[PDB]
């Protein structure tokens, strides 16, 4: 997904699927559309839900990636708190 700004409905579906690869790919697809500068908050609860505690680095690294380029803007699955869904289980 080079740059496709309407694809956020499919990404939500792909983000949790019971297959780790699909989830990684989805979250990756979100990153590439934001970096170009395209739509991203719809997904947030889905994105945040699988990855949170785990020591399994790749999804964690992917989520960690998305928190330095848009964390502030996206708020469906995060909202505003001191120990946000950016860092609460990332302790």
């Amino acid at each position: 997904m080079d740059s496709e700004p309407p694809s956020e409905i499919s990404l939500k579906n792909d983000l949790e699927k019971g297959d780790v690869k699909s989830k990684t790919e989805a979250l990756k697809k979100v990153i590439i559309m934001i970096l170009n500068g395209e739509k991203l908050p719809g997904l947030l609860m889905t994105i945040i839900r699988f990855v949170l505690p785990l020591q399994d680095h790749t999804i964690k690294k992917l989520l960690l990636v998305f928190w330095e380029i848009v964390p502030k803007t996206t708020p469906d699955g995060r909202l505003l708190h001191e120990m946000i869904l950016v860092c609460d289980a990332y302790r």
């Binding site: 949790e16 609860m45 839900r49 949170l52 699955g77 909202l79 120990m83 869904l85 609460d88 289980a89």
Partner: protein, 159 residues
């Protein structure tokens, strides 16, 4: 079947989960995070998300709401100071659109303790009678003995 089990810290959520999964009473630590496990009961495989109840984590439950078929809300029946707080958490949880049709099962837990509030008392304090929009049930439990646990899984499976 997808299940979300929450409640305030120390209610007994992880004790419940691992009693169900291992038939064992484990020595818990506060859960900073979740535990997720699959349990077989009578041809149903329940995937239970036990999400820690301390404040930081409490702020995160909303990410586990979506796709939830049923909600186990664990209450420490012996703690009277925090029952109002439980009531407050649970009431706005009931207002959550992703939790809209999910089956609501309250566990009044630590029923084994001498001064534990009764399930009826808890039902009045949590305002359970006022839920008309979906299925609810309250069950007295003791997670250490295992009492009431499977009666819960039973009720849940009949959603």
């Amino acid at each position: 079947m997808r299940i979300l089990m929450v409640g305030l810290d120390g209610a007994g959520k992880t004790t419940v989960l691992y009693k169900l999964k291992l038939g064992e009473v484990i020595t818990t630590i506060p859960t900073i995070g979740f535990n997720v496990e699959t349990v077989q009961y009578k041809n149903i495989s329940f995937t239970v998300w036990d999400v820690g109840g301390q404040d930081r984590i409490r702020s995160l439950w909303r990410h586990y709401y979506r796709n939830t078929e049923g909600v186990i809300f664990v209450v420490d029946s012996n703690d009277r100071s925090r029952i109002g707080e439980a009531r407050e958490v649970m009431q706005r949880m009931l207002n959550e659109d992703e939790l809209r049709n999910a089956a609501w099962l309250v566990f009044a837990n630590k029923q084994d303790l001498p001064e534990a509030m009764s399930a009826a008392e808890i039902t009045e304090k949590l305002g359970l009678h006022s839920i008309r929009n979906r299925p609810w049930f309250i069950q007295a439990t003791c997670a250490t003995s295992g009492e009431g646990l499977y009666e819960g899984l039973e009720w849940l499976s009949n959603s």
